RNA sequence: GCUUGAGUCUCGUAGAGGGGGGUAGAAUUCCAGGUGUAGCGGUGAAAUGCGUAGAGAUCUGGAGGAAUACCGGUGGCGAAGGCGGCCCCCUGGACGAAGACUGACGCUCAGGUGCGAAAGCGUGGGGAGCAAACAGGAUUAGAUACCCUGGUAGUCCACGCCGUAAACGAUGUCGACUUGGAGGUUGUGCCCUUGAGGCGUGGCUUCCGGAGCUAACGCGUUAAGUCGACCGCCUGGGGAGUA
């Protein structure tokens, strides 16, 4: 059931991508957005778009560089069944540094490079590379 | 079933019986009950009758 | 209130108790504020196979709108009455006229 | 089909013997083949049609 | 499964108006209606196991709905079960 | 823009999902390809095609079917171009090194047709050795001499030529090919939409390819 | 608070979905009688068995139980078990088309409760055919079998037990996402209905097949692919599903 949307996002992406699908949409939310943000701002998607009002609709434009998709792997990490939280010193780094980890902090949803520089930590929503 | 054959001829002309009864429902009802096993039978009668 | 087809068939040797019957069954349904959408005294008809010994028997068609109650006691009256050698009250879905 | 009383339209969906003719032969549609058989079974009961050709 | 006349009657006896059809109270009551009706169907028969399944489904549905109301508006809850006559 | 009078599209169901981007069809149980997206594929098509033909064109007009074999042993055959118009003896690229002597037997025989031994031995051996040569001729004509190693490859019917194309993909050979709606692209580097087994789209583009190798740098 | 998740409401549609009662023809066995006369029955071959008290064969009338040919179909319904003549009554679920109402009321679920083929048990019925047991006849080296002649429980009904099956898709439930192709079945919108149709749009179903997955076989939008929620369960064979 709907129960975990954020994985559903991570997934609708993962999938469409593997389906060399141009765009991809889904029910939106404060949260979906903030991540679609980091995802664009870190250059894993072209650009997002939320087209509705009562029943908002996040829409992401996918990217493809060579022939490949740009997003080579996108996984949940925290989840309803099992929440993950890391302190600053204990934040994770994906692919040695390449690619990134989305972490939500008391100062908003930012990357790991980010939250690290911000000197704090929070819930590690997902990994991406 | 019935042939009320008329005038000029002597041959049986009853190819009718190879269109229904006889070995039809007769070789059928003759023996082992069956029960759930005709299912397994007729399940091959379509696997076949697909092509 | 529902409808039904209904089509009892009667023994020849009771042929002219058919007017009395139809009279009666209709008096019975009308009585309970039910209509009667078709009626057809098909009379003596030949049988597709002999039933009960004897061939040919008198048919009667009907088409009623009546409550599950009079339609009940009809089916019985049909048993009680060993002059009706068959009967069959049927479907419904809205009245019907003409056919046959 | 639409009706069991239709012995005229009905008598061309059965063999000499009186056996219901399979849809495959008549090429009828599904939904209706049932409607058909029902209407036939009805007629057989009301002696409007032979179960058998044994008469 | 209950009449249009009957079901109507009760919407009109429990909601704001005919149309306020999905009002908690209403659902409960037209459920409660069918359950009770049924008690006699299963009085005779009793071996109608299959149909019985549907009836329980009615009870547990109603049960969850009753549970909802109570949490929401307790005031409305109590009135209901009184007026519907259950929860001994 | 268009030039293909009547090659429009072709091929009914049997369509390959991956061939959607070049389809605008839907005429009476059959796709018309996207005419207006094929021609931008003569651009690039005959371009890198020629861009190498002046760097020196070694080709292989590979295309078979007793229904366009001869129409390939044509000006397709004639120019800076080799060809195959019969059963693609599988491994003829990937095993050229074995096949290279299936050549030696062709020559060392016809070179000896009106020469060497010939009208001699027996008049059994005769046409009973020209059957050796006849056989060889088709499927191993166009090969004859391969002077400059097979360099690009131009194929009529992508998939019907499973093997040919495959070998190329394996040996790093450009493969230019036209692909009907039904066929699988991506085996083909330079892809050309539109019909691939009708007497026109052949000759047309086929003949038109002969026209760009046969002239690049005088 | 919100309306898309989930319900409620309206009119319809298909269905061997369940429960109860009624009823029909075909056959078998039996009883009675006509005609008729020496065999019938059975097997690989036999014999046991049946027939001169007249069998089998045929015809007519009658009794009774059990199951419903044809339709019939990788057809349909149900949670699973499983559900096929016809009719009425009672009743569960599913689906579709419009909009209207509720407003997260949801998913899952150890414990618990219910249901749950066949066989089997308890009291009473009921008993045509079938048939463990048992008897006879054969086969065989042996034959506690396979085959034959018989035939008891049982197989049927009511009431109540039992709670198991390769109870299997050997695939837990719910949700979202991801190329295609040919069928079957069932709703519904539009099109000179002017074709027995034309183009869409749901529910369910069979076959084939792409990525992907897999030890492989295979699965593949009805996943065994890609993800998440909760539950069940596995940790070498035998011992043992035993003590
Ligand atoms: Mg009898
Ligand atoms: Mg008799
Ligand atoms: Mg219903
Ligand atoms: Mg139980
Ligand atoms: Mg039992
Ligand atoms: Mg018993
Ligand atoms: Mg025995
Ligand atoms: Mg078990
Ligand atoms: Mg498959
Ligand atoms: Mg499909
Ligand atoms: Mg899954
Ligand atoms: Mg034990």
Curated annotation (Swiss-Prot), chain B:
Q: Which UniProt keywords apply?
A: Ribonucleoprotein, Ribosomal protein, RNA-binding, rRNA-binding
- Originating species: Escherichia coli (strain K12)
Task: Identify this protein by name.
Answer: Small ribosomal subunit protein bS21
Q: Which GO terms describe its biological process?
A: cytoplasmic translation; ribosomal small subunit assembly
Q: Does the keyword Ribosomal protein apply?
A: yes
Of the GO CC terms on this record, one is: cytosolic small ribosomal subunit
Cysteine disulfide partners in this protein: none
Any one GO MF term held by the record is: structural constituent of ribosome
Included range, full protein: 4 to 54 of 71
Role this protein plays: Probbly involved in recognition of ribosome rescue factor SmrB in stalled/collided disomes; fusion of protein fragments to its N-terminus decreases ribosome rescue in the presence of SmrB.
Q: Which domain of life is it from?
A: Bacteria
Q: Compositional bias (Basic residues) at which positions?
A: 43-51
The protein's assembly and partners: Part of the 30S ribosomal subunit. In stalled ribosomes contacts ribosome rescue factor SmrB.
What is stated as this protein's family in its record? Belongs to the bacterial ribosomal protein bS21 family.
From Swiss-Prot, chain C:
Positions of post-translational N6-acetyllysine modification: 93
Any keyword Lipid metabolism?
A: no
> Which cysteines are cross-linked by disulfides?
none
Q: Which UniProt keywords apply?
A: Acetylation, Ribonucleoprotein, Ribosomal protein, RNA-binding, rRNA-binding
Q: Output the GO biological process annotations, alphabetical, semicolon-separated.
A: cytoplasmic translation
PTM comment: 5 different forms of the protein, varying only in the number of C-terminal glutamate residues, were isolated. The sequence shown is form bS6-6, which is the longest. The first two Glu are encoded by the rpsF gene, the other Glu are added post-translationally by the RimK enzyme.
Annotated GO MF terms: mRNA 5'-UTR binding; small ribosomal subunit rRNA binding; structural constituent of ribosome
Where does it sit, as one GO cellular component term? cytosolic small ribosomal subunit
> Would you identify the family this protein belongs to, as annotated?
Belongs to the bacterial ribosomal protein bS6 family.
**Cited function:** Binds together with bS18 to 16S ribosomal RNA.
Question: Tell me, how does this one assemble?
Answer: Part of the 30S ribosomal subunit. Interacts weakly with uL2 in one of the 3.5 A resolved structures.
- Protein's recorded name: Small ribosomal subunit protein bS6
Source organism of the structure: Escherichia coli (strain K12)
**Organism ancestry:** Bacteria, Pseudomonadati, Pseudomonadota, Gammaproteobacteria, Enterobacterales
Swiss-Prot record, chain E:
Which Gene Ontology terms describe the biological processes this protein takes part in? Answer: cytoplasmic translation; regulation of translation; ribosomal small subunit assembly; translation
Q: Which Pfam families match?
A: Ribosomal_S15 (PF00312)
Q: What induces it?
A: Part of the metY operon that extends to pnp, also has its own promoter.
User: Taxonomically, which superkingdom?
Assistant: Bacteria
Q: Record's GO cellular component, any one? A: cytoplasm
Q: Which UniProt keywords apply?
A: Ribonucleoprotein, Ribosomal protein, RNA-binding, rRNA-binding, Translation regulation
Show the GO MF annotations: rRNA binding; small ribosomal subunit rRNA binding; structural constituent of ribosome
SUPFAM superfamilies in the cross-refs = S15/NS1 RNA-binding domain
| Main function | One of the primary rRNA binding proteins, it binds directly to 16S rRNA where it helps nucleate assembly of the platform of the 30S subunit by binding and bridging several RNA helices of the 16S rRNA. Binds to its own mRNA, stabilizing it 5-UTR and preventing its translation. In the E.coli 70S ribosome it has been modeled to contact the 23S rRNA of the 50S subunit forming part of bridge B4. In the two 3.5 A resolved ribosome structures there are minor differences between side-chain conformations.
Description of how the protein assembles with itself and partners:
Part of the 30S ribosomal subunit. Forms a bridge to the 50S subunit in the 70S ribosome, contacting the 23S rRNA.
Q: Which family does it belong to?
A: Belongs to the universal ribosomal protein uS15 family.
Tell me what this protein is called.
Small ribosomal subunit protein uS15
Task: Specify the taxonomic lineage.
Answer: Bacteria, Pseudomonadati, Pseudomonadota, Gammaproteobacteria, Enterobacterales
Its encoding gene is what?
A: rpsO
From Swiss-Prot, chain F:
GO terms, biological process: cytoplasmic translation; ribosomal small subunit assembly
* Entry superkingdom: Bacteria
GO cellular component, alphabetical, reads: cytoplasm; cytosolic small ribosomal subunit
Keyword field: Ribonucleoprotein, Ribosomal protein
Presence of keyword Ribonucleoprotein = yes
Q: Offer an example of a GO molecular function term for this protein.
A: structural constituent of ribosome
Q: Which Pfam families match?
A: Ribosomal_S2 (PF00318)
Q: Which residues carry this modification: N6-succinyllysine?
A: 107
Indicate the family of this protein. Answer: Belongs to the universal ribosomal protein uS2 family.
Q: Please give the subunit comment from the record.
A: Part of the 30S ribosomal subunit, contacts bS1. Some nascent polypeptide chains are able to cross-link to this protein in situ. In collided ribosomes contacts ribosome rescue factor SmrB.
- Function statement: Required for ribosomal protein bS1 (rpsA) to bind to the 30S subunit.
PANTHER family according to UniProt: 30S RIBOSOMAL PROTEIN S2 PROKARYOTIC AND ORGANELLAR (PTHR12534), SMALL RIBOSOMAL SUBUNIT PROTEIN US2M (PTHR12534:SF0)
Q: What is this protein called?
A: Small ribosomal subunit protein uS2
Report the gene name. Answer: rpsB
């Amino acid at each position: 059931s709907m129960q975990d949307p954020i994985a559903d996002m991570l997934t609708r992406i993962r999938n469409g991508q593997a389906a060399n699908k141009a765009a991809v949409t889904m029910p939106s939310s404060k949260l979906k957005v903030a991540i679609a943000n980091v995802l664009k701002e870190e250059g894993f998607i072209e650009d997002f778009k939320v087209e509705g009002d009562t029943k908002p609709e996040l829409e992401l434009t996918l990217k493809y560089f060579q022939g490949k998709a740009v997003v080579e792997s996108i996984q949940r990490v925290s989840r309803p069944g099992l929440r993950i939280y890391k302190r600053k010193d204990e934040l994770p780094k994906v692919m040695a540094g390449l690619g990134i980890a989305v972490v939500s902090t008391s100062k908003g949803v930012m990357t790991d490079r980010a939250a690290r520089q911000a000197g704090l930590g929070g819930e590690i929503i997902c990994y991406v590379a | 079933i019935k042939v009320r054959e008329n005038e000029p001829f002597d041959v049986a002309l009853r190819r009718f019986k190879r269109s229904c009864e006889k070995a039809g429902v007769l070789a059928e009802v003759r023996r082992r009950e069956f029960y759930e096993k005709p299912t397994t039978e007729r399940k091959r009668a379509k696997a076949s009758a697909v092509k | 209130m529902r409808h039904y087809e209904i089509v009892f068939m009667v023994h020849p040797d009771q042929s002219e108790q058919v007017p009395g019957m139809i009279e009666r069954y209709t008096a019975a349904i009308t009585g309970a504020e039910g209509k009667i959408h078709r009626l057809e005294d098909w009379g003596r008809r030949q049988l597709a196979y002999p039933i009960n010994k004897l061939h040919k028997a008198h048919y009667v068609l009907m088409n009623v709108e009546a409550p599950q109650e009079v339609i009940d006691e009809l089916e019985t009256t049909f048993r009680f009455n060993d002059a009706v050698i068959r009967s069959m009250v049927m479907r419904t879905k809205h009245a019907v006229t003409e056919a046959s | 089909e639409i009706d069991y009383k239709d012995i005229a339209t009905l008598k061309n969906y059965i063999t000499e013997s009186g056996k219901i003719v399979p849809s495959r032969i008549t090429g009828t549609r599904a939904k209706y083949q049932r409607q058909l058989a029902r209407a036939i079974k009805r007629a057989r009961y009301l002696s409007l049609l032979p179960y058998t050709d044994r008469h | 499964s209950l009449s249009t006349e009957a079901t109507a009657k009760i919407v009109s006896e429990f909601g704001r108006d005919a149309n306020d059809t999905g009002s908690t109270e209403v659902q409960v009551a037209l459920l409660t209606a069918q359950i009770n009706h049924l008690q006699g169907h299963f009085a005779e028969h009793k071996k109608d196991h299959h149909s019985r399944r549907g009836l329980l489904r009615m009870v547990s549905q109603r049960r969850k709905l009753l549970d909802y109301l109570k949490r929401k508006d307790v005031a409305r809850y109590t009135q209901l079960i009184e007026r519907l006559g259950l929860r001994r | 823009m268009l030039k293909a009078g009547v090659h429009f599209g072709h091929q009914t169901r049997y369509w390959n999902p991956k061939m959607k981007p070049f389809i605008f069809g839907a005429r009476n149980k059959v796709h018309i390809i996207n005419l207006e997206k094929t021609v931008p594929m003569f651009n690039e098509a005959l371009a890198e095609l020629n861009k190498i033909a002046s760097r020196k064109g070694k080709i292989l007009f590979v295309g078979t079917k007793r229904a366009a074999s001869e129409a390939v042993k044509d000006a397709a055959l004639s120019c800076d171009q080799f060809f195959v118009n019969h059963r693609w003896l599988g491994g003829m690229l990937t095993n050229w090194k074995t096949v290279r002597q299936s050549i030696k037997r062709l020559k060392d025989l016809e070179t000896q047709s009106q020469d060497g031994t010939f009208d001699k031995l027996t008049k059994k051996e005769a046409l009973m050795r020209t059957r050796e040569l006849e056989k060889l001729e088709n499927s191993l004509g166009g090969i004859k001499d391969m002077g400059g190693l097979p360099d690009a490859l131009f194929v009529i019917d992508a998939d019907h030529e499973h093997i040919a194309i495959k070998e190329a993909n394996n040996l790093g050979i450009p493969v230019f090919a036209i692909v009907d709606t039904n066929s699988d692209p991506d085996g083909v580097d330079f892809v050309i939409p539109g019909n691939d087994d009708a007497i026109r789209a052949v000759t047309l583009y086929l003949g038109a390819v002969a026209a760009t190798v046969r002239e690049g740098r005088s």
